Design a protein around this ligand. Structure first.
Ligand SMILES: *[C@@H]1O[C@H](CO)[C@@H](O[C@@H]2O[C@H](CO)[C@@H](O[C@@H]3O[C@H](CO[C@H]4O[C@H](CO)[C@@H](O)[C@H](O)[C@@H]4O)[C@@H](O)[C@H](O[C@H]4O[C@H](CO)[C@@H](O)[C@H](O)[C@@H]4O)[C@@H]3O)[C@H](O)[C@H]2NC(C)=O)[C@H](O)[C@H]1NC(C)=O
Ligand SMILES: *[C@@H]1O[C@H](CO)[C@@H](O[C@@H]2O[C@H](CO)[C@@H](O[C@@H]3O[C@H](CO[C@H]4O[C@H](CO)[C@@H](O)[C@H](O)[C@@H]4O)[C@@H](O)[C@H](O[C@H]4O[C@H](CO)[C@@H](O)[C@H](O)[C@@H]4O)[C@@H]3O)[C@H](O)[C@H]2NC(C)=O)[C@H](O)[C@H]1NC(C)=O
Ligand code: NAG
Ligand code: NAG
Ligand code: NAG
Lengths: 121, 327, 335, 323, 327, 327, 121
């Protein structure tokens, strides 16, 4: 039982910092993922971070552009969207993955989905 | 009754049978029903973060290649026939070490049914991983799962379900762990996606609640008694330097031995547990009691009377806050 | 195919499920044992380990062959195609047949039909022990083996050489740490069961424990602790805190030594010889503190209207403890 | 000859009379030894000669009237009951020098099948009266796949004679009694399975092992009594004696349950330590009460008699409760 | 869909198939692609200098002998078919003990593709050697590798590559070691030459950073508290010989028990670790505090006031230098 | 290149091949060359008197039954072919427990040569016995051997040699034991006679030199520090009975705990080691220091000044003699 | 990442001492090798030493002529070239070998190559 609230999207022309605040049984769900769904297109993997250790992975599109990290004090994950592009125009969602729930990349493996900030540039 | 007739029927079933091909190969997935009868949970290890389970694991499916007519019985066959049949490639994704019992024979069953339903049973002991959150230890509640999956067949080829729904797992009442009570068990079914495709998954989880009683007796009570012992100093004359300094040292050093011993029974976690917080509080009390005498000694060459009331009162407050937060 | 033909002819019309001379004369198997390494003996588990070259020799007329060479030294897996005795170790709780780089089996077919079949085994056999005289004790660990299935009417076991040369235990083979293998004796016995009556061959290994480790680990600290307690007698009675600490620490030290002595030793109901020594030494240490308590108690009465008790204790205690040592060592070392 | 003929056409996958009445399997046990009885693991290791007897008409031969003594090679050819130990944590066969199996094929078709197996059997132990406690351990035998309609077990008549439990000599326990029980009402999910169980009662030996367990605790109580005869003027002397008896008792309590890491139950040994701890702690409090009021000699005089009498009284109650 | 047709096709594939000969025997080397999916790192042992890894190990290669036509599917076959196929002779050169999981079946997969590509998957637990540099322990960073090589086939016959390059290894985020964080992983490919020839090698390495928290609590904090305890002596009257000598002894002896205990948890290395340096510093402080009293005692039959300032100040300096050098 | 041609050739080689008969059965002995490539020495155990070795073990011999023509290549064959060939019955006479690594396949190689030379390689981990002389422990030098012999074939049938002479064993530089340095290795060849005949033997031995550093730190230094601590008593006033008696007791008892602990790490040998001699010397010093006070106490109700010089001087002499004798 | 600087070559007619000073992650590279490359000829093994233990090996040509040893304090290895010969005329190189990097003799197994002192006699 995890609740995710994300904020800091909005519209810009640029550096941005999406944030994702978790609460509840985060121990059972050690991984947080960032997805993004463009209108029409399928929901697409952006990156993921382990709560413990900060082991990070990125999709190629955003490799060496976006940076994820977290702070366990607040139970917060942030996607620092630097060097934005008009391809980066989607509803960005946050999600939690169970320990044994499969590959990072696949949104169907994830159980607890944030609301989803729309971001247009 | 006619054993030559039964032998003929079974020989015909296995003639040209290809173990390499699943039932309905190339067609809709084979539905495999699973039920577990728990025999025991032998051990739960915090240091290794695992538990050991013994169970009777049964698989139900239909193989139309094995359908037989003219015999209104279910055929129980010798377990060695299993080597001539297709069976599912079921494995336990979070297991560390498992085996099928082998005395006096392999603990395995095969029962055929006239419609081609195959019942395949195994008696398995598994040591399975269970990551534990020890922040509240030993007032903690743990979730230990068993993850059951098809190794090589995707959901295009095989599907799992809990046969009987919420009654598919029996024997939870048999589990007798001295240190834990089983609060609840749950059965889950889902599909898990990997690079090689989507695979069927069944998950069995238990909620374990640690029994406090052992820890009260083993660690909490000695620490309380040492802390009380430290207060005896305040009733001793301030000229009794050897006596009062001895009390300070012995209680302080005893609290260190208790702390270090305890954490050698547990994994090398980097965070502070509930029990660590208690021992650190008790250490501070007994250390301040010795420092109180140093202060008395320092000025005499009153404070004791104030110490006789403030120390027991503060320790009671400390315990109240602690046990309310965690219980 | 000069020799391939011979081997095929021998195996042709041969049933490995039937003993040689089936239904007729009793099959005699000659057994000799070469101990490569007598492993450590576990007192706590009452078991010992041993690696041997278990050789078996019998006659099978079904394998008689005529040819140029007299002995056919064949591969180790020729064994599975021929009948072999089913010898098992009755007291062997765990045993392993080595398989490194090959199954460690020897198989030779002599011209007249004699078969030499040897295998390399690591045997863990149960050895009951009586630790009443521990550590000044000795044990005779046996090794019983015989046919599991064939009764004495169908197969018997005889030592290949005489009852003295059949078992070979070189001094270099001794891997014992705290034991010494004085000698070995063999014997043959017969046991009866519901399945049948079987011949059992027994090998006894006489082990004498070396007390050098226990002398310094336990006895020396215990003796010195008693001597340490007696030092408090020479301390003046006015130093009450000093003599009090002497008694307390010596008592605590004896408690630690008593627990450590039984740590490796298995838990038994009877009292070992070392248990008596510790108990007596504990009494002397405890009595030393009682003596000081009597001295302090009496001197307070004298103070309230250079001690005789101290003078007596300085002499009586060393003599009584010294007398106990002479009695204790003579009684047990004589056995 | 005819041995090959019996195997020729023999159906290994089917029990004798698959569609007929269930097969009666006589069961006998020869307990070779019992060892490695651990309370912490709640398990014991047992080595037995397990004998099974049943009739198979397919193997009936009439060429000779002599029983056929066969080795372990012939075992794989024949159908065997799927007897397994229900409460066995682990088990294995002795295969040195060969597999310890024998087959005795009588002309009428009766088969004698014996195997030498060593099994580690789980045994739940109640440590309420530890160490003055008696434990009952069981050995359950059952058919894994064949229900009551296929295989029915029963103890053989010879079981009463060759059980071999009397000859067993255990390091710490004594087999007070043994019992062979038959349960036909197991009723597992698959079906009804007859179960044969062997119950033997183990009594822990009372001797130097028990004396050593209670020796330091009793002596430490006597150590605290020494301070009573010591003058109250020597404050460091009595305080040092008082604290050491308390601290050492605390270490003993920690070390007592260290040998049983997961024994969360209450043991009689643990209760005795608390009784010892109360007396040694009271003695230090007794001096502290006397020292605080001396800013009385009668307190020590009472302590020299009350404490030895009170400790004697509680021991009588303690030992009477655990018999 | 037609199982007799599929059975015929597969039977034809295996008819006259020689497991002894690699694909393209006598020709160019067979290219074998590797992918690892990490399941867990169960244990890291300093005493044994090894770690235990569980992974899904997959091998990709083309065997033109297994190419089939007229079936537009990938055939997932029962794992027992692996015994009838050639597979690479891959081994782990730095492994100590490994096994393929066997419940309920051998955790093995075979997937064939129409062009003759074979996908061979295994679930393996391996204990693998990892030589550790403990000079900075417990403030150390370790490099633990897994070395993957062909046993008998040289680079004339077989070649390895990481299938997917830097994405060939998945599941690094799953590793949950309490005492370590995984800083980085790297994938390397090279050829290794032996007397018997040149062999293909793949190397997977991890950088492990020890978490300090446990050690602060277990060893550092007790040593600090003992050292502070030693200073109490300086506030006690110099006539209190029993009290002040007791403080000196107890702190000195406690520091010895802490030292010796610690090194019994670690291998018998001949060099001094970081933690050894700290404990030796703390020992010197508490030993000098007792010697300070011996000096005071020696002349009385001032120094304490000078000790009350110089000792805490020196210990602060000592800690500053230490923690700067190593952090 | 033509795989059917190679398959035909190899099939012909194995047609009518009798694994039961050694090459040149009934003729001169087969010469078997042996080379070892050492991978690791994982562990050396004094308690169990054994060591654990991992090596690549290779055997070279000629089997004229396997000679092939018309292929100018060396054939590397799948390791499963080894089950169809004769191989030597080599074993390790002083091994305790050994296994061939089995992941992902049996770590085994077979390479055939046109002239019928067979190259057979195995990767083996062995625990092998090594009787140690601990009289000088821990200043000792040990000789640990590996004895390689033919199990059943006598020197009439098989002969061993080190292939390459003194270069037959590689990888000695890889051995990284913290507690030991490898001083030397030697290769020996001889015949060993038993009742069953004369057998070929190869012996590989190493000379191990224990590193002192760990022992200096773990046992020697604490004992020196306790002995120095004992001398503090002589600077304390003779009226300080509690203080001076406390010093005597604590040092004496600490030296007993150190002694007994040490010997629990080692086998139960009946003789005195070098370290035992040191600890016994240190015990005598600290015991005499307490007895010195008893003597002072005895007459007061001088000696201390004489003790302040004679004790440190005697301990220096004791250490000088000890470390000269043993280093 | 290892850096190797070698010195003490030069031209003589005699005893010589080449030295090889290492710096960096020497723990991962426990073995130092000496090679020599004559003009035209292939690069040739001379000898090797383990940093820890000093387990030494030599090519036959230089066996009982050259002697290698080291000192871990300076992180230095030295080839003491005694009893020189006109065959011993080559660019002597120093190199480091990884723990699992194969046989001592083969220069392709070595990763970090010193500059290479030319020595003529
Ligand atoms: C120990 O911790 C584990 C997690 O690590 C817990 O396991 C979770 O258990 C909960 C139930 O308690 C699971 O939630 C359920 O998941 C089911 C599966 O859904 C997936 O698959 C379907 C297709 O089959 C997809 O459509 C779906 O998107 C998912 O991918 C759902 O079917 C369940 O829905 C039902 O219940 C909910 C309310 O809970 C209703 O709203 C629905 O209408 C429906 O009735 C449910 O959502 C969860 O998936 C489990 N997680 C994992 C990782 O397995 C254990 O429960 C816990 N143990 C204890 C004792 O607490
Ligand atoms: C733990 O410690 C191990 C060593 O014990 C480290 O492994 C080393 O990793 C580095 C990379 O980080 C490796 O360096 C690379 O080697 C590659 C292989 O080269 C060999 O093979 C080729 C042929 O395939 C030969 O031509 C060559 O001579 C070698 O024999 C190179 O291809 C790499 O070159 C690439 O990067 C360099 C920069 O690094 C560029 O200059 C090049 O142009 C090219 O892009 C590279 O040199 C090294 O070989 C590894 N050593 C071993 C023994 O395997 C681990 O990295 C370490 N782990 C952690 C987490 O630190
Ligand atoms: C049993 O079945 C066989 C095979 O069909 C048949 O030949 C035989 O007559 C049957 N016997 C009986 C009694 O039905
Ligand atoms: C057959 O088994 C039943 C049930 O155990 C038993 O009552 C009966 O006596 C047995 N028959 C014989 C002949 O032993
Ligand atoms: C390969 O060898 C086979 C068998 O000798 C032969 O029939 C075939 O023609 C050969 N093919 C080639 C291309 O040489």
């Amino acid at each position: 039982q995890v609740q995710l609230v994300e904020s800091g999207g909005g519209l810009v022309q640029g550096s941005l910092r999406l944030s994702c605040a978790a609460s509840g049984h985060t121990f059972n769900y050690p991984i947080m993922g960032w997805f993004r769904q463009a209108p029409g297109k399928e929901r697409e993997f952006v990156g993921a971070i382990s709560w413990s250790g900060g082991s990070t992975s990125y999709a190629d599109s955003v490799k060496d552009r976006f940076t994820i990290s977290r702070d366990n004090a607040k139970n917060t994950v942030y996607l620092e969207m630097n060097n934005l592009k008009p391809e980066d125009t989607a509803v960005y969602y946050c999600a939690a993955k169970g320990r044994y729930s499969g590959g990072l990349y696949y949104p169907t493996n994830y159980d607890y989905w944030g609301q989803g900030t729309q971001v247009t540039v | 009754g006619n054993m030559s007739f039964v032998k003929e029927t079974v020989d015909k079933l296995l003639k040209g049978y290809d173990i390499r091909l699943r039932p309905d190969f190339g067609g809709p997935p084979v539905c495999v029903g699973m039920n577990i009868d728990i025999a025991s949970i032998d051990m739960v290890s915090e240091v290794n973060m695992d538990y050991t389970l013994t169970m009777y694991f049964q698989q139900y499916w239909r193989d139309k290649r094995l359908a037989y007519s003219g015999i209104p019985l279910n055929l129980t066959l010798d377990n060695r026939v299993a080597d001539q049949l297709w069976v599912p490639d079921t494995y336990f994704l979070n297991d560390k070490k498992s085996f099928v019992h082998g005395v006096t024979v392999k603990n395995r069953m095969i029962r055929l049914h006239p419609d081609g339903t195959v019942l395949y049973g195994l008696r398995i002991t598994t040591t399975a991983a269970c990551m534990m959150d020890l922040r509240r230890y030993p007032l903690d509640e743990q979730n230990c799962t068993l993850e059951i999956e098809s190794y090589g067949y995707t959901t295009d080829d095989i599907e799992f379900y809990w046969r009987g729904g919420d009654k598919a797992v029996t024997g939870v009442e048999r589990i007798e762990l001295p240190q834990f009570s089983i609060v609840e068990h749950r059965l889950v079914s889902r599909n898990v996606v990997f690079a090689t495709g989507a695979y069927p998954r069944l998950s069995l989880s238990f909620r374990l609640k640690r029994n406090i009683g052992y820890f009260i007796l083993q660690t909490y009570m000695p620490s309380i008694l040492i802390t009380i012992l430290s207060w005896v100093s305040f009733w001793i004359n301030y000229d009794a330097s050897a006596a009062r300094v001895a009390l300070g040292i012995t209680t302080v050093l005893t609290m260190t031995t208790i702390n270090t011993h305890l954490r050698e029974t547990l994994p090398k976690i980097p965070y502070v547990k509930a029990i660590d917080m208690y021992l650190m509080g008790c250490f501070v009390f007994v250390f301040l009691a010795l420092l109180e005498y140093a202060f008395v000694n320092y000025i005499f060459f009153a404070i004791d009377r104030w110490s006789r009331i403030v120390f027991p009162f503060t320790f009671s407050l400390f315990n109240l806050v602690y046990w309310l937060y965690y219980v | 195919e000069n020799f391939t033909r011979i081997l095929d002819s021998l195996l042709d019309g041969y049933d490995n499920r039937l003993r040689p001379g089936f239904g007729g004369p009793v099959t005699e198997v000659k057994t000799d044992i070469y101990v490569t390494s007598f492993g450590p003996v576990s007192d706590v588990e009452m078991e010992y380990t041993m690696d041997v070259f278990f050789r078996q020799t019998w006659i099978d007329k079904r394998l008689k062959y005529d040819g140029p060479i007299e002995i056919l030294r064949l591969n180790n897996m020729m064994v599975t195609k021929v009948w072999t005795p089913d010898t098992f170790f009755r007291n062997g709780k765990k045993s392993v047949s080595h398989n490194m780089t090959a199954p460690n089996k020897l198989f030779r077919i002599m011209r007249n039909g004699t078969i030499l079949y040897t295998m390399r085994l690591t045997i863990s056999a149960e050895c009951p022990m009586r630790l009443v005289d521990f550590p000044m004790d000795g044990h005779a660990c046996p090794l019983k083996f015989g046919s599991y299935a064939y009764p004495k009417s169908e197969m018997i076991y005889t030592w290949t050489k005489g009852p003295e040369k059949s078992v070979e235990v070189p001094k270099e083979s001794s891997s014992l740490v705290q034991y010494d293998l004085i000698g070995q004796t063999v014997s043959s016995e017969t046991i009866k069961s519901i399945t049948g009556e079987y011949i059992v061959m027994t090998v006894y290994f006489h082990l004498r424990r070396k007390m050098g480790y226990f002398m310094i680990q336990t006895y020396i600290p215990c003796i010195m602790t008693v001597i340490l307690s007696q030092v408090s007698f020479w301390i003046n009675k006015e130093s009450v805190p000093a003599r009090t600490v002497f008694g307390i620490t010596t008592v605590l030290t004896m408690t630690t030594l008593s627990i450590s002595a039984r740590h490796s030793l298995p838990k038994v109901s009877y009292a070992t010889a070392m248990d008596w020594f510790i108990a007596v030494c504990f009494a002397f240490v405890f009595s030393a503190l009682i003596e000081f308590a009597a001295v302090n108690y009496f001197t307070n009465i004298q103070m309230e209207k250079t001690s005789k008790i101290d003078k007596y204790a300085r002499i009586l205690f060393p003599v009584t403890f010294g007398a106990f040592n002479m009695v204790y060592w003579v009684v047990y070392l004589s056995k | 000859p005819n041995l090959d003929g019996l195997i020729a056409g023999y159906a290994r996958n089917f029990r004798p009379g698959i569609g007929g009445p269930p097969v009666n399997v006589a069961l006998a046990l020869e307990v070779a030894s019992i060892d490695h009885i651990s309370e912490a693991n709640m398990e014991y290791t047992m080595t037995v000669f397990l004998h099974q007897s049943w009739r198979d008409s397919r193997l009936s031969y009439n060429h000779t009237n002599e029983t056929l003594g066969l080795d372990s090679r012939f075992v794989d050819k024949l159908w065997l009951p799927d007897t397994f130990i229900v409460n066995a944590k682990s088990a294995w066969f002795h295969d040195v020098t060969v597999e310890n199996k024998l087959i005795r094929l009588q002309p009428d078709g009766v088969i004698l099948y014996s195997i030498r197996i060593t099994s580690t059997v789980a045994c739940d132990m109640d440590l309420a009266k530890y160490p003055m406690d008696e434990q009952e351990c069981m050995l359950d035998l059952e058919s894994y796949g064949y229900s009551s309609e296929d295989i029915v077990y029963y103890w053989s008549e010879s079981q009463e004679h060759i059980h071999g439990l009397d000859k067993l000599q255990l390091a710490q326990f004594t087999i007070t009694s043994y019992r062979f029980t038959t349960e036909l009402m197991n009723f597992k999910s698959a079906g009804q399975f007859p179960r044969l169980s062997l119950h033997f009662h183990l009594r822990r030996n009372r001797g130097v092992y028990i004396i050593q367990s209670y020796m330091p605790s009793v002596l430490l109580v006597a150590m605290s009594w020494v301070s009573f005869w010591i003058s109250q003027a020597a404050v460091p002397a009595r305080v040092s004696l008082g604290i050491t008896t308390v601290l050492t008792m605390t270490t003993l309590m920690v070390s007592a349950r260290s040998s049983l890491p997961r024994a969360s139950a209450i043991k009689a040994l643990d209760v005795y330590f608390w009784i010892c701890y109360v007396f040694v702690f009271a003695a230090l409090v007794e001096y502290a009460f006397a020292h605080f009021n001396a800013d009385a000699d009668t307190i020590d005089i009472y302590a020299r008699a009350v404490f030895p009498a009170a400790f004697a009284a509680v021991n009588v109650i303690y030992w009477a409760a655990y018999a």
